[PDB]
Amino acid sequence: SGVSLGQALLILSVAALLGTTVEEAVKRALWLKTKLGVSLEQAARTLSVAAYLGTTVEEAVKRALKLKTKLGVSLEQALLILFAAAALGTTVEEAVKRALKLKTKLGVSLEQALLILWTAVELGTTVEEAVKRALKLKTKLGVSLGQAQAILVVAAELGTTVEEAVYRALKLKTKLGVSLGQALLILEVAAKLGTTVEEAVKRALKLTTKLG
């Protein structure tokens, strides 16, 4: 029970994505988190997958649950599938094949594999090249693969070099005393909101009750 800064930022991003007020975004998210008994993050993510698919939230969930039972995955994983497949513009079976192809090939989570696939979409590169870049960062900065891919996409959303992205991220981790995760989040949210980092955070803090 409580809103970590992280959750708050995401919800901002959702509010943005839906194009609703952040009061209504958070109302919907907290309503979904209880109705489904998921994390708040997962509730926001579900809102964002439904939007991404151009569907209603029930419809998305109904579909996820047909993939949860059919493939024996977790709900979130089912949502990720749907999202990945959308992004690609393929079928779920194809998406699922490619992801379990990356999962085995690289020794990662299914979730990681999907996200790699989605990063590739955004970067406009091959999945081989995306993994390349992510492994380059992982090593260069001693960061996790997740971080690496995150940085990549954030660098993309900003329309800046990965170097400059890191600079600003690190600069926000020093200036504000956040983790790298948080900084990246903040950067992307602010870019999606079309505001400063300071504005985005102040907005996030209005929702933050827990201490991330």
Author numbering: -1 to 210
Paper text:
Here we address these limitations by introducing an artificial metathase—an artificial metalloenzyme designed for ring-closing metathesis—for whole-cell biocatalysis. Our approach integrates a tailored metal cofactor into a hyper-stable, de novo-designed protein. By combining computational design with genetic optimization, a binding affinity (KD ≤ 0.2 μM) between the protein scaffold and cofactor is achieved through supramolecular anchoring. From the catalyst perspective, we sought to address this challenge by designing a derivative of the Hoveyda–Grubbs catalyst (hereafter Ru1) that contains a polar motif, aimed at interacting via H-bonds with the protein, as well as improving the cofactor solubility in aqueous media.
For the fifth round, we screened a fragment shuffling library (540 colonies) by randomly recombining the beneficial mutations from third and fourth rounds. The highest TON was achieved at 50 °C. At pH 3.6 and 50 °C, Ru1·R5-ΔHis afforded a TON of 1,028 ± 159. The X-ray structure of Ru1·R5-ΔHis displays close structural similarity to Ru1·R0-ΔHis, with a backbone ΔHis of 0.6 Å and a Ru atom deviation of 1.0 Å between the two structures. Notably, compared with Ru1·R0-ΔHis, the evolved variant Ru1·R5-ΔHis features an expanded and less hydrophilic channel leading to the active site, which results from the three critical E4G, E144G and E179G mutations. These probably contribute to the increased affinity of dnTRP_R5-ΔHis (versus dnTRP_R0-ΔHis) and hinder the approach of hydrophilic species (including GSH, OH− and so on) that lead to cofactor inhibition. In developing a computational model of Ru1·R5-ΔHis, the structure was predicted using AlphaFold2 and further refined using Rosetta FastRelax in the presence of Ru1. Yet, the resulting models did not accurately reflect the deeper placement of the Ru1 cofactor as observed in the crystal structure.
